Design a protein around this ligand. Structure first.
Ligand SMILES: Nc1nc2c(ncn2[C@@H]2O[C@H](COP(=O)(O)OP(=O)(O)OP(=O)(O)O)[C@@H](O)[C@H]2O)c(=O)[nH]1
Ligand SMILES: [Mg+2]
Lengths: 18, 10, 570, 198, 142, 180, 415
């Protein structure tokens, strides 16, 4: 863990915008 | 330095 | 020491030569005159080591002006190095050639400059352009003879966009130092080519590209619209200097822009977020941003109409930054944020900076004078400051009250009683003279005006020339208005300022007052106590001719100094 | 009890002006905390540190009651520290020397020669318009003494009183009569200086 | 009489300070700063005498730390130099090979010696052995 | 933590306490302090400054700080109020004219938030002449009963005789010390 | 148009200088120190100095003043940018900013200064590029600088392609002594530590209000940042055209975007302070702090600094939660809290004495600021949509990012 907010996985783009 | 030197050198 | 260093430098050991060079650099960096060893280091110059070549070049550059005669033994080495296959070596040699301030040294380097003008390496091209610019600055006639202008002009129309930007900056510097004859101005195709390479230019390249557009004068709205559209993306750059250059270019283009077209509105809308971002820059750049805003405030004041919260001076803001913020707020003062300005001035009036307190008082007075809607609020704030029991604060409040009375004294009769007993023992000439003038002009709501002036009449002959004149004027006004209680006071003042006053102007004023009193006291009311017209306040805005010139001069040292470019250079 | 030498070494170890100011502030806070508890054992070290801070350019307004308390103390070192504090941080414009008049009067009759000499020197260095008025009688009493080491101090105190109070020189007219035969150089010099001042 | 006598180093640090005239703390600090600036901006052939604010500002430093005095214009200038030399000799005898570092550590002793030597800006101990003996006796008291 | 050392110190007496000396000039403050510390009435000059002394009684070292009643020394009692645990007021029952001034000074001093934890200690000084008032008339004139949240006791002491000092000391010890 | 840039010291000694144009004599640096001393003593000291017709602009560094003498009316903003770039390069190359490293790496320092700028025109600005061409422990210049892509060095090979993002939030609240907050601005910071193989072109996508409105999805929580600044690698053309954040990520940690917009929400911490200071008798510190943030968020390492009296001594603290320590150097009491859960209410009661002697001059009323830092909280509600990681070779990236909320200019005006 790490203070200041744990790292989270990020997507590649908005899948709902086509 | 120059501070440890005697004021009058005596 | 020196002998040992010379012996080491005259050795065939590479490690020993490197150690001697490092020792010489440390002595030179430490403040040791190693110029006498330059001829010894001349022999140990052609070395395969790249680090040694750089140190030797630095020593020669630092020992070139000191020993110009001894510098004649480096032309062969420079010529040999000018054909070095390594691009870094060629760039270093080009930089060293232009850094040598030798009149006879640049003459022999003309051929290497011509050879390196067509360098394929973009770094090599930039180094050649820099060397050409340095030679032109050192010898404009030599540069003209070498004919580097044609090569420089074609440099912008080549690849290596950073090299193109370096060449463009060099050409602008040559034309900037030129008397404007044979300018390097380009047609719209050149502007379009630069704009195409603007997106590929670096942070330094972007600034150089934006500098070129500052000299060109647009003539078509469509061309101006395209230029504005191209410069709009520059506002999203982290470079503050790039942001400042883009803002200056946009302001210059807005001079020929049409207010009817929606492009001006879009540019104004997009400029405010840029100004807000720039205001949050580093303290060193904070002053520059404040100066730029002040310069552009007089041009398009409607751009920053809603920008008032950021104008507040931060607690950790510097004294210069606080002064700039106060100046921006005073220039940006408006009736919409009058209460906020008054609160900030009251907050700014509680600081420990005496100069800051005086500046805040002056700004509050200027805001009160400019906008009459807050005249009552300004009077209340001045009364509160006077009641705060601060000597400097009291003097500032007295000065502000005196200024307001001369500007808006129609409804200023309600503060005479409050200001009548306000610890008038202060001996500050600015506060004393202001109080005396207020008492003389407002000698109607105070029934003890003669008594108050009695205390100040003890040292009228030795108070001050301006103070004495103000006291005499107040006494004359009191005698003209109410001579029953000041009949003897007027005579005493005339005797003191006419017999005991040796000042030429003061003596003449006293004699004139005595003559007027002895000629027609009734006419003195219509002559001395006349209704003065409106006081013409001095406008703080710069002249339109200077404002237009200052718009082009964006980011220069003159913008911070608020002086013309020709009035600050030597 | 932080020694003055330790404080001097710590000050010398600081390089930045801000760091030196922070160290001085910490030392002053420690001194104020010690004084608030009415410490009397290590008061000499605190007084020396406060004097060094004041000489270095630090405020010492809160360190006025401690000097007054140490002035009325009994230790010779404490008395010397109080006298030094009164001479350095105590002045007529300060107004904190008014309460020192009783301490000076009590020490005026002290048997110890160093204490009396120190009190006389402090009174001469910090001569006030009102202090001399309440101490003029004491100065004249010691002027007729036969102590060679105290004759110079009495002459200096009389000269300081005369300079501060020119109207008080009338009381020294008969005190210095028949004093030109002093064998000691200091006593004769003090008598000559007093005569010249009169 | 000497209005103020203070010991200051060449770099501007003040090793001693003794003013015989009651002045405001801010005014005293400003006067000391001005004196330091004048001394720090003075050459070696200025005669060591300055008439600043109608005061005989005599500056004479025999080492890195300099010494200055301010007296009214009513006596000879050489008397101040002789008194300063005598005080320096007495301090050296009391301490022994006095240096700048020892001055900071012995600030209280130096102040006591100065008080015992000159009081109120006037000379109090003309002899050199008597003052040293008195200082030694006072130190031995405890 | 352990308090064995504190208990051992308090077994044979460790508490000392504090005291202050307040009152008008020539009101027996110096003489009263000399009698309390030494036991004899020693003539003293005007209290230009202050007198500091410590009195050890019942294993308690109650330091006494004499304060003058002079006009220039009346406002100086605020400085002496710091680091003070007790306060003694010296009144002049034979000075009717100065009685009002003493009452006003006492009211001004008692109206300070810092001087709130100190109990009232009023000594009926000058209790040797017929002009001196009793322990109730002086208190009524000074309004000692109107001092809310103040524990004050009226004691009459004669400067020449010294009677009543022991009773006043015992009352002060009882008021301050809440132990057996 | 600075004639020469030099690095000075606190004692007036120049640590290092490098002439670029030669139009100003090197002896002018000596007069800079007396001018600075006079300006500081007279209140006229400014970063841009002026020695006659030559201006010596100086910037206060960690240990020395970066004096950049100039002769003509050159680009002051350009000079400041060059100085900032030089400071950043020195910080990257040298971990310490003091005289110890100035005199320790002079051999490489001179080469770096020569390569940085020539004839007053800066040329090299990439710290990675400078390290790839100038090292303290030489080959031809890299082609990345010559090529257009100077923000992504080609040929980078990594075992794994991991990017560490950081959603840094700065909450600045300017609360006046009257209780009204005047300056309430929140500045975003999108900093990503990209460490992958090659030079992938980042395709940033977030829940922006402008983007949602353009795409027709302007109905959810979209962050409308007043000021958004792209990084060097970010392509401004795509952003201007359709807000397309397409750029080559750098090799390492860099700030791609930084939001900056005003805040209209209630403060995360509501602090009520009481000054029950007696007239030279005692001081009362009625400090009450209320956590206005969500209870699910905890403020780690909360330090609410309450300025205590300058001459105050013997203070007693009566608080409920959080350690209170009075720092003599700071001359104030900091309400130190390890973890502060949202909605927490902390009450403090300070009590200390004051010296009998009154102060000669006033000390002012510095504002009270807190040092709260609660991570894993997105107050602005801006949610990142996706990060378009495109590689010519083709690889599967696993980027990571964390949202950190801290207290910036959260200063409350003293009463
Ligand atoms: N002889 C005598 N004097 C008394 C008596 N009661 C009060 N006094 C007064 O107490 C005074 C003692 O003087 P000090 O020793 O100086 O003490 P003080 O009363 O505080 O006077 P100050 O120190 O000047 O404030 C005398 O002057 C008397 O006026 C008494 O019963 N007998
Ligand atoms: Mg008495």
């Amino acid at each position: 863990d790490r203070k200041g907010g744990s790292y989270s996985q990020a997507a590649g783009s908005d899948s709902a915008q086509s | 330095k120059g501070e440890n030197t005697s004021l009058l050198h005596p | 020491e020196i002998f040992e260093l010379k012996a080491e430098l005259n050795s065939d050991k590479k490690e020993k030569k490197k150690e001697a060079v490092k020792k010489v650099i440390a002595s030179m960096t430490v403040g040791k005159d190693v110029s006498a060893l330059f001829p010894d280091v001349v022999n140990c110059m052609q070395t395969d080591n790249l680090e040694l070549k750089k140190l030797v070049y630095l020593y020669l550059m630092n020992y070139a002006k000191s020993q110009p005669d001894m510098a004649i033994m480096a032309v062969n080495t420079f010529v040999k190095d000018c054909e070095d296959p390594n691009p870094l070596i060629r760039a270093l040699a080009v930089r060293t050639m232009g850094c040598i301030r030798v009149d006879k040294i640049t003459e022999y380097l003309c051929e290497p400059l011509r050879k390196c003008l067509k360098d394929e390496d973009p770094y090599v091209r930039k180094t050649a352009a820099v060397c050409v610019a340095k030679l032109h600055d050192i010898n404009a006639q030599l540069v003209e003879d070498q004919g580097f202008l044609d090569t420089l002009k074609d440099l912008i129309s080549d690849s290596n966009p950073m090299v193109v930007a370096n060449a463009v900056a060099a050409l602008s510097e040559i034309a900037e130092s030129h008397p404007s004859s044979n300018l390097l101005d380009l047609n719209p195709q050149s502007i379009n080519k630069l704009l195409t390479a603007l997106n590929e230019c670096t942070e330094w390249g972007q600034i150089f590209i934006l500098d070129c557009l500052a000299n060109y004068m647009p003539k078509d709205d469509r061309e101006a619209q395209s230029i504005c559209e191209r410069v709009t993306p520059r506002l999203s750059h982290a470079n503050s200097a790039v942001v400042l250059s883009a803002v200056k270019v946009l302001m210059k283009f807005m001079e020929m822009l049409s207010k009817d077209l929606d492009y001006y509105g879009t540019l104004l809308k997009k400029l405010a977020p840029p100004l807000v971002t720039l205001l949050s820059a580093e303290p060193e750049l904070q002053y520059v941003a404040l100066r730029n805003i002040n310069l552009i405030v007089q041009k398009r004041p409607e751009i920053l109409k809603h920008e008032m919260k950021v104008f507040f001076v931060k607690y950790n803001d510097p004294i210069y930054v606080k002064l700039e913020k106060l100046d921006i707020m005073i220039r940006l003062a408006s009736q919409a944020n009058i209460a906020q300005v008054l609160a900030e001035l009251r907050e700014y009036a509680t600081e420990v900076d005496v100069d800051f307190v005086r500046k805040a008082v002056r700004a509050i007075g200027r805001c009160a004078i400019k906008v009459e809607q807050s005249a009552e609020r300004c009077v209340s704030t001045l009364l509160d400051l006077i009641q705060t029991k601060v000597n400097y604060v009291v003097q500032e409040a007295i000065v502000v009250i005196k200024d307001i009375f001369r500007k808006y004294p129609n409804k200023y009769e309600s503060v005479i009683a409050t200001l009548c007993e306000n610890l008038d023992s202060l001996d500050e000439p600015e506060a004393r003279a202001a109080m005396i003038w207020i008492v003389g002009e407002y000698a109607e709501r105070i029934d003890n005006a003669d008594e108050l002036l009695e205390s100040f009449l003890e040292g009228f002959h030795d108070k001050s020339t301006q103070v004495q004149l103000q006291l005499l004027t107040a006494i004359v006004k009191l005698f003209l208005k109410k001579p029953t209680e000041t009949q003897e006071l007027v005579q005493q003042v005339l005797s003191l300022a006419t017999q005991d006053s040796d000042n030429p102007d003061l003596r003449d004023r006293g004699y004139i007052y005595w003559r007027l009193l002895s000629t027609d006291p009734v006419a003195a009311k219509e002559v001395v106590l006349a209704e003065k017209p409106l006081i013409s306040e001095e406008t703080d805005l710069i002249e339109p001719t200077l404002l237009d010139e200052l718009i082009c001069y964006i980011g220069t040292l003159a913008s911070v100094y608020h002086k013309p470019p020709s009035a600050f250079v030597e | 009890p932080i020694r003055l030498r330790e404080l001097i070494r710590t000050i010398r170890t600081a390089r930045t002006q801000a760091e030196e100011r922070e160290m001085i502030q910490k030392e002053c806070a420690a001194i104020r905390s010690s004084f608030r508890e009415e410490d009397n054992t290590y008061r000499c070290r605190n007084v020396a540190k406060l004097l060094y801070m004041h000489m270095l350019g630090y405020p010492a307004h809160f360190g006025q009651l401690e000097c007054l308390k140490l002035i009325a103390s009994q230790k010779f070192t404490d008395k010397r520290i109080g006298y030094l504090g009164a001479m350095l941080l105590l002045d007529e414009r300060q107004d904190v020397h008014l309460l020192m008049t009783n301490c000076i009067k009590n020490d005026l009759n002290h048997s110890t020669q160093f204490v009396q000499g120190l009190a006389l020197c402090t009174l001469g260095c910090m001569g006030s318009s009102e202090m001399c008025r309440d101490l003029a009688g004491e100065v004249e009493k010691l002027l007729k003494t036969s102590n060679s080491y105290l004759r110079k101090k009495a002459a200096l105190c009389a000269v300081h009183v005369i300079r501060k109070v020119p109207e008080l020189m009338e009381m020294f007219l008969p005190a210095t009569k028949n004093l030109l035969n002093e064998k000691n150089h200091g006593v004769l010099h003090t008598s000559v200086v007093l005569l010249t001042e009169m | 009489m000497i209005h103020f006598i203070l010991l200051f180093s060449r770099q501007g640090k003040l090793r001693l300070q003794k003013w015989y005239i009651t002045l405001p703390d801010k005014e005293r600090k400003k006067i000391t700063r001005e004196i330091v600036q004048i001394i720090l901006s003075r050459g070696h052939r200025t005669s060591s005498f300055v008439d600043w604010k109608e005061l005989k500002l005599v500056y004479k430093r025999y080492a890195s730390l300099y010494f200055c005095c301010a007296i009214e214009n009513q006596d000879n200038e050489l008397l101040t130099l002789e008194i300063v030399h005598r005080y320096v000799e007495l301090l050296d005898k009391y301490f022994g090979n006095v240096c700048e570092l020892d001055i900071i550590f012995n600030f209280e002793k130096a102040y006591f010696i100065l008080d015992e030597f000159i009081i109120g800006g006037e000379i109090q101990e003309t002899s050199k052995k008597i003052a040293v003996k008195a200082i030694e006796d006072s130190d031995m008291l405890q | 933590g352990n308090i064995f050392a504190n208990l051992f110190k308090g077994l044979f007496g460790k508490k000392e306490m504090r005291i202050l000396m307040v009152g008008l000039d020539a009101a027996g403050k110096t003489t009263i302090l000399y009698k309390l510390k030494l036991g004899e009435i020693v003539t003293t000059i005007p209290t230009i400054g202050f007198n500091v002394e410590t009195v050890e009684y019942k294993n308690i070292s109650f330091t006494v700080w004499d304060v003058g009643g002079q006009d220039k020394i009346r406002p100086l009692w605020r400085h002496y109020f710091q680091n003070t645990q007790g306060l003694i007021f010296v009144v002049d029952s034979n000075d009717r004219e100065r009685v009002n001034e003493a009452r006003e000074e006492l009211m001004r001093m008692l109206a300070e938030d810092e001087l709130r934890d100190a109990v009232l200690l009023v000594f009926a000084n000058k209790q040797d002449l017929p002009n001196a008032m009793n322990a109730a008339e002086i208190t009524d004139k000074l309004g000692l009963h109107s001092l809310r949240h103040r524990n004050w006791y009226i004691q009459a002491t004669c400067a020449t005789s010294g009677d009543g000092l022991y009773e006043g000391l015992d009352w002060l010890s009882n008021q301050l010390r809440n132990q057996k | 148009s600075a004639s020469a840039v030099y690095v000075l010291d606190l004692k007036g000694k120049v640590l290092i200088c490098r002439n670029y144009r030669g139009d100003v004599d090197m002896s002018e640096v000596e007069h800079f120190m007396p001018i600075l001393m006079e300006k500081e003593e007279e209140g006229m000291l400014s970063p841009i100095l002026a020695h006659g017709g030559v201006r010596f602009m100086w910037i206060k560094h960690n240990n020395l003043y970066l004096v950049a003498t100039s002769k003509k009316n050159a680009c002051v903003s350009l000079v400041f940018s060059f100085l900032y770039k030089v400071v950043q390069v020195f910080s990257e190359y040298f971990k310490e900013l003091e005289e110890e490293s100035i005199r320790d790496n002079f051999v490489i320092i001179y080469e770096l200064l020569d390569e940085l700028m020539d004839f007053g025109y800066p040329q090299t600005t990439d710290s990675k590029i400078l390290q790839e061409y100038i090292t303290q422990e030489a080959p031809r210049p890299p082609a990345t600088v010559t090529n257009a892509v100077s923000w992504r060095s080609e040929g980078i090979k990594y075992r794994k392609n991991e990017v560490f993002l950081d959603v840094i939030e700065a909450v600045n609240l300017l609360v006046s002594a009257n209780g009204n907050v005047l300056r309430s601005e929140i500045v975003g910071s999108i900093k990503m530590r990209v460490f992958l193989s090659g030079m992938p072109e980042l395709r940033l996508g977030l829940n922006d209000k402008v983007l949602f409105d353009n795409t027709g999805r302007g109905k959810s929580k979209s962050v409308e940042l007043e000021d958004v600044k792209f990084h060097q690698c970010v392509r401004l053309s795509r952003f201007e055209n359709d807000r397309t954040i397409s750029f080559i990520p750098p090799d390492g940690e860099f700030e791609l975007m930084s939001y900056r917009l005003n805040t209209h929400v209630k403060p995360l911490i509501w602090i009520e302070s009481v000054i029950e200071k007696h007239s030279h008798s005692r001081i009362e510190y009625m400090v009450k702090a209320k956590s206005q943030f969500k209870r699910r968020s905890t403020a780690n390492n909360v330090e609410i600094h309450i300025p205590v009296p300058n001459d105050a001594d013997s203070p007693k603290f009566k608080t409920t939660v959080g350690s209170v320590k009075w720092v003599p150097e700071n001359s104030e009491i900091v309400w130190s809290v390890k973890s502060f859960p949202g909605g927490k209410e902390y009450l403090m009661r300070a009590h200390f004495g004051l010296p009998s002697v009154e102060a000669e001059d006033k000390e002012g009323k510095p504002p009270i600021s807190v040092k709260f830092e609660i991570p894993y909280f997105t107050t602005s509600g801006i949610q990142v949509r996706y990060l378009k990681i495109i590689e010519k070779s083709g690889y599967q990236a696993l980027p990571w990012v964390r949202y950190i909320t801290q207290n910036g200019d959260y200063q409350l005006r003293t009463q």
